[PDB]
Amino acid sequence: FGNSRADMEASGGNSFNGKGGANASNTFSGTLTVTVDQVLANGNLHVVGEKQIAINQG
Amino acid sequence: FGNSRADMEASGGNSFNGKGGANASNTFSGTLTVTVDQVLANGNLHVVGEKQIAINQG
Numbered sequence A, B: 001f002g003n004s005r006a007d008m009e010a011s012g013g014n015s016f017n018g019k020g021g022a023n024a025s026n027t028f029s030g031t032l033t034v035t036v037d038q039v040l041a042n043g044n045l046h047v048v049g050e051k052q053i054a055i056n057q058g
């Protein structure tokens, strides 16, 4: 060890960060009167309805 | 490792952000007297009505 033959110095680093996300929301707060389309074998009713409103410009 | 042969340094990044939205609202707070148009087989009434108001300039 007379010289710096044994003198040693070293550093090392490794950092990793990963992220991920997702969202999906929906809301509906109306009331619509529909009409029966047909009666199924079990008695369930197929209902279809439509409502058109022309407030102004569309 | 005498020289910088092993000396290493690196960085990397990847960021992504996506968004989306939509809204649709409507309101109606009137009163209109309508007239029956015809009587359906089940007794339902087809009602049609119209009201015209000329406040001024239109």
Ligand SMILES: O=C(O)[C@H]1C[C@@H](O)[C@@H](O)[C@@H]([C@H](O)CO)O1
Binding pocket: none
């Ligand atoms: O004993 C040896 O072998 C050495 C001692 C140091 O001086 C070393 O560095 C080398 C030099 O390169 C000679 O020129 O010689």
Ligand SMILES: O=C(O)[C@H]1C[C@@H](O)[C@@H](O)[C@@H]([C@H](O)CO)O1
Binding pocket: none
């Ligand atoms: O032992 C070798 O092969 C080396 C030592 C370094 O000096 C290196 O860089 C290369 C240089 O390119 C020679 O000119 O030679």
